[PDB]
């Protein structure tokens, strides 16, 4: 039956475990340590009223967007520390924002359950809302741009959806999850994406067929943030169980855990470096931590915030790392 | 070049105008008091919404209610269209002034669910700061449903039998002592959860609220006064 099929899947997982002789840090113990990685607030973009809850970088790796529950959507400039736009919002409760690779449009996923899409470079030069993507019943946790026209949107009604803007309807629906789908990251090759939910599981979906290609259930609690490994065969999950984990597609098995007994708070955000040695985790014990990805050792601390770290974003080239928090202060780090 | 200087001057003008707009909105955001409304459906959220509408706006999903009393404006958020699980969107309501919590008085079976809801509110890591106003709604129908009889509280709550009335404000329940013992048991049962733990950084403000209670927005007002004043009295020692 289904239980016998689950036993068969446990057998295949045990076969992959027999393929898994030693740990990755055990395998890469011939490779020496990364070393200490200090960092400092190279700029401090201040100017929010309420808690900054999510940010997104640009593909220029120069301009970025941050969103807070006051009702402001602020495009910061990292280099000059000047705010390019600050869109006033219809509803204050905003749980994410996203920034088009073309740079023209900014998305605003909110708890009003309507996604909003805004055009920055308008002909008139005055910024208004382009369209209102409305097909969800739960709050909108995360959203990312597939292309300039296609957008992937997770929500709290346990379904992801892929959307086209001028059409105005859900092109594809992603309904496999039971818990609230709360994080997503999309691959560089862009035809496949991943999503973790509150049911301690990640599904990876082909964006054309819209079905769960693979399911991973390593975690023990809610999963707050997820991020692809850069070269595309793996991804990391940051989850409320105070553990972080690196998961692989090709082996179909988890590889690495990232845990220390003294830290107990849940991971809120996660990001990678460009090379992928250097994993970055926001936290509720007020300090971002940064891990060697291939030894699972705490390389360092990036502590400058007074409250919980909501959002964490690495540039494409990989120099700057922006971070926000509920102290309303956004800071750019090395 | 000179064009780079022109771009820098344009960026300076844009950041100055944007900071001016944000500085103008800072005062109106700081002045207006935000109020989460939470509760069960049979507990009359909608009727007290109608009472503040005695005293456009996006009705999609969340409902909003505006009311001002004594030159102070309260903007009060009802989480309507959202799905039933609340472990994650209740984190979004951190910086709010006070969590109004509404309980149906009359029917004793869902009171245990409301008590577990209150205990979950009180011990949450992000909701430990916020003072919780408490409302006990449809107070008359409680009195009718106990004075009609044949409906034992004792079956649901066994500690009612080993309970007596501590103190009261007598003329309103002066028709009956046993309804007084009932409703004051309900107050006491919430306050066991309220005074269970903490360091006195957030407080429970119970009110015995009928269907027809007009001025109860001002009771909301005065106990917002108590919460903000206690916040400031802690703010003296904190800085």
């Amino acid at each position, epitope marked *: 039956l289904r239980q016998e099929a689950e036993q068969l899947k446990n057998q295949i997982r045990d076969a992959r475990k027999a393929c898994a002789d030693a740990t990755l840090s055990q395998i890469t113990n011939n490779i020496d340590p990364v070393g200490r990685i200090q960092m400092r607030t190279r700029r401090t973009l201040r100017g929010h009223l309420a808690k900054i809850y999510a940010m997104h970088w640009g593909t220029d790796s120069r301009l970025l967007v941050s969103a807070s529950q006051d009702g402001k959507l602020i495009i910061w400039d990292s280099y000059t520390t000047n705010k390019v736009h600050a869109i006033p919002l219809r509803s204050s409760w905003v749980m994410t924002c996203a920034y088009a690779p073309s740079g023209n449009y900014v998305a605003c996923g909110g708890l009003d359950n309507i996604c909003s899409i805004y055009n920055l470079k308008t002909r008139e030069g005055n910024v208004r809302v382009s369209r209102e993507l409305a097909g969800h019943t739960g709050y909108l946790s995360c959203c990312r741009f597939l292309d300039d026209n296609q957008i992937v949107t997770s929500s709290g009604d346990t379904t992801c959806a892929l959307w086209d803007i001028e059409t105005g309807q859900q092109t594809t629906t992603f309904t496999g999850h039971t818990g609230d789908v709360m994080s997503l990251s999309l691959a560089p090759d862009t035809r496949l994406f991943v999503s973790g939910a*509150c049911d*301690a599981s990640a599904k990876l979906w082909d964006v054309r067929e819209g079905m769960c290609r693979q399911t991973f259930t390593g975690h*023990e609690s809610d999963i707050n943030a997820i991020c692809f490994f850069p070269n595309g065969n793996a991804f990391a999950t940051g989850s409320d169980d*105070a553990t972080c984990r690196l998961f692989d597609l090709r082996a179909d098995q988890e590889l690495m855990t990232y845990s220390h007994d003294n830290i107990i708070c849940g991971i809120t955000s996660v990001s990678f470096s460009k090379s992928g040695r250097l994993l970055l985790a926001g936290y509720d014990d007020f300090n971002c931590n940064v891990w060697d990805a291939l030894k699972a050792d705490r390389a360092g601390v990036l502590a400058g915030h007074d409250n919980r770290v909501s959002c964490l974003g690495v540039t494409d080239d990989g120099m700057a790392v922006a971070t926000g928090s509920w102290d309303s202060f956004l800071k750019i780090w090395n | 070049t000179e064009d780079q200087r022109n771009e820098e001057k344009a960026q300076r003008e844009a950041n100055k105008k944007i900071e001016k707009q944000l500085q103008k909105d800072k005062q109106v955001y700081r002045a207006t008091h935000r109020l989460l409304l939470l509760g069960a459906d049979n507990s009359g959220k909608s009727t007290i919404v109608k009472q503040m509408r005695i005293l456009s706006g996006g009705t999609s999903g969340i409902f909003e209610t505006k009311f001002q009393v004594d030159k102070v404006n309260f903007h009060m958020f009802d989480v309507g269209g959202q799905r039933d699980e609340r472990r994650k969107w209740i984190q979004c309501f951190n910086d709010v002034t006070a969590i109004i919590f509404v309980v149906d008085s009359s029917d004793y079976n869902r009171l245990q669910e409301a008590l577990n809801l209150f205990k979950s509110i009180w011990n949450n890591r992000w909701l430990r700061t916020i003072s919780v106003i408490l409302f006990l709604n449809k107070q008359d129908l409680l009195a009718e449903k106990v004075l009609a009889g044949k409906s034992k509280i004792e079956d649901y709550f066994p500690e009612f039998a080993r309970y007596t009335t501590p103190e009261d404000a007598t003329p309103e329940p002066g028709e009956d002592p046993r309804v007084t013992r009932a409703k004051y048991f309900i107050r006491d049962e919430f306050l066991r959860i309220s005074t269970a733990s903490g360091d006195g950084r957030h407080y429970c403000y119970p009110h015995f609220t009928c269907a027809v209670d007009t001025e109860n927005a001002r009771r909301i007002f005065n106990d917002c006064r108590d919460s903000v004043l206690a916040r400031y009295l802690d703010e003296i020692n904190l800085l």
Partner: nanobody
Amino acid sequence: QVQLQESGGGLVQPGGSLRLSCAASGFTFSNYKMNWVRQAPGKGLEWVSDISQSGASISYTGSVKGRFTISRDNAKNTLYLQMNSLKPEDTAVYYCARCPAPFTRDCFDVTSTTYAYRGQGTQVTV
């Protein structure tokens, strides 16, 4: 992989005393706090029993307060709910509910129909 199976339960004589177990795997059992939640037919879900991560502190719903008992064996990694002096309306489906967060006093376990950390449940009959 998180794992919850109940054991025990079924039909018994109406005055009888019935012992149930909940096995939990895929996490440290020590830090989470356990609940039992019962579903009578034609009803909503209801929280019945609560016990902390330690097991020193404990809480019961009002109906079955003096009647039933709950125990945890963290080293043995098991949960138990024993019913004593059974009453005929208490027949229900007895889910084992795991609290979402660790090191956390509050939970939001009893929900509409769906929840990640409930067990599949067993049905008891008077």
